[PDB]
Symmetry: D2
Subunit: 229 residues, 4 copies
């Protein structure tokens, strides 16, 4: 058996165990700022990602084992105008050598790819439901499952995501501690069929392609654990 685990109550401004991609950076105060901010205001056409340095062993072909993992993180999405926002933030697993994909609605993850993601989508694209949503995505920008999500501008969101290998169940929940509101969605996901044996895990986010569709995507903390046995 193999157990892997880490916790950040904040991020180091010069992170060494975090692989920063695109526009992502850590602020002096220790906030993982995925998308660009200038003069304290979010900028459009931004894409940032952040992955944990050590690959995670999610399934083994020789031993026919699949990992179970659980992760918590808090995140803020703040937009100058509440009615106009894009695009969103996601937690994702992809091959270790994963690089940023397309911007805008593709969230830095997909294009037109072996990526499984839990997205917090703030803009309705062609492949989306009408309302903002939390989605479970399996190798597509189109979610297999989603729940409508009443996004609260600038309010801290607490996320908990778990994968139970014995039942192939991935579950994601978001709670706003400010008004004790919550949402949850689950899906049946076969990690062996969606991903390679080893992955890197982390976050991706992208601001809108227009000036009037901008917002921040900041991660405040992050704890993760995975066991393969």
């Amino acid at each position: 058996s193999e157990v892997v685990s880490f916790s950040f109550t904040k991020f180091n401004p010069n992170p060494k165990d975090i692989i920063l991609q695109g526009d992502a950076l850590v602020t002096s105060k220790g906030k993982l700022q995925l998308t660009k901010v200038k003069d304290g205001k979010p900028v459009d056409h931004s894409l940032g990602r952040a992955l944990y340095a050590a690959p995670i062993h999610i399934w083994d072909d020789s031993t026919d084992r699949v990992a179970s993992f659980a992760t918590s993180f808090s995140f803020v999405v703040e937009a100058p105008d509440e009615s106009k926002t894009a695009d969103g933030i996601a937690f994702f697993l992809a091959p270790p050598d994963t690089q940023p994909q397309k911007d805008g609605g593709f969230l830095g993850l997909f294009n037109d790819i072996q990526t499984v993601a839990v997205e917090f989508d703030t803009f309705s694209n062609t492949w989306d439901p009408s309302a903002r949503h939390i989605g479970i995505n399996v190798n597509s920008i189109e979610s297999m499952k989603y729940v409508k999500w009443g996004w609260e501008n600038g309010k801290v969101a607490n996320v908990y995501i778990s994968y139970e290998a014995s039942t192939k169940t991935l579950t994601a929940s978001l709670t706003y501690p400010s008004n004790a509101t919550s949402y949850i969605v689950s899906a049946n996901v076969d990690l062996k069929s969606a991903l390679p044996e080893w992955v890197r895990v982390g976050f991706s986010a992208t601001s809108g392609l227009s000036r009037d569709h901008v917002e921040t995507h900041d991660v405040l903390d992050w704890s993760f654990t995975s066991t393969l046995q």
Copy 2:
């Protein structure tokens, strides 16, 4: 700081770190059977509870600190008839010397008491909403918050409950891995004002007061962690 933690993948038929109360027992196969079963069938007028042996330090008056805790458990409620069921199961915190309260709709927790509970209610009493629900209860059998809960007869339910002291937020989620369905509810709960500094944590359950309102309440596993700092 103080950290307390434990995990059970199953229960020992003669549990020594579990304080069994009322009808509760552990089966040969390691299932925490809270309410009575005879010839493999549930019996009415049953009340069972189970608490972890070591008290949990949830708040300290001298140091003005409050604990944050997280727990996972799976549980099955199986009734012979899907339309007629009572009463339910809960995870709860109460003073260390807590003893069983009233049966039936009171779930072994309340009467007519310092208990905070997350209930999975299967019967609509005077103080309930119409539908079966997951409730957050603060010193009352009446929930301060609840979510409608589509109970699945005999199907394993995976529960995750967390309390974040810095935001007084208690969140509870239930997922059925069989059809990837989930529910969640949150509430603002001040543990300092609801409970004493030290508590015992565990489960309580009660079958209905009539023969045609019977069901099992079995816990399959349980992991818990709490930190006071």
Copy 3:
């Protein structure tokens, strides 16, 4: 499988998960003072013990499994005169209902009993080697194995004890961080043959039977973990 774990960076003056026996108490500053102190000076004829509230499942007859456990703790033994000291402190496992045994050289553990202990002996009795020692004791005040121990008056000692079930090896080490000095001893110990399936773990200590053989026995912190699988 079953995992049990706890950590104290200090102790609560009114401990609820600690069963205090004999003279043991927790000071305002959070120090587990096993033996009596008056006007800041140690008193003779004192015996104190402290156990964790939840029993530990160390072996299971039905499943033929034995637990592996690891514990860390720091402790100070301070005597007014460096040449005259008695008796010592130990970490021990005993049946859950264990009560204080004899005082003086018997360390509150033994008499003339199912107890396994790692002792830090400060006085040479009939059954001892000449020098102060760290001993591994299996149902006797006489150690099966020991190492000579250069006790440092008033200096913090860091202890690490591990039991590896697959090789029946119990290992104990003491280090004084003040001058980077260490000692270690191991023994082959069959827990199934020495102890019952369930035990309580903790510390015991006793000051000498004479006024000129007095010393403190204070525990500053304690972390413990055990897995049965």
Copy 4:
């Protein structure tokens, strides 16, 4: 605060979170074989190293914090002739981009370098004590502290190493579960002055420079944890 942790009960033959350097490889049966073996026999002039993929944050200049860490591992050194052996195995911390250094007595770590190591030396070089020893090395192949070590050919050794930042104490212990024999050594080590803020941790080993001074250096398991707060 930041916590990092991992456990291996065995190694994956194609390790993805392990950076293999030099001759190091993982056998089919999951043994980290640091130095070369042909036809089941050790070969001379071999050097192998293995590091965990994610850097470890051991000290922070801005926050004046230093990490405390603890690690366990088992290892076998087997030589065809008990009287003729070289050179040894070590657990070490070095800059993230660390590469193999010199072979033979330099253990793959040093030359003639920012590396702190706990070595299990099997050959007496110019800079060594006479007997085989466990050494604590701080930026030199010459140990600042050591303890004589009765190496047992082919017998599993259980190692426990801890660093306590608050007292700058690094402690290392070796136990042979086969005959319940142990050794320990400690040293005062300032990690801030010896190493950079971020390091990679792992093992290095080297077989002798002659045919009659060959031995294996195999690691069987490994668990590690570090907290910066």
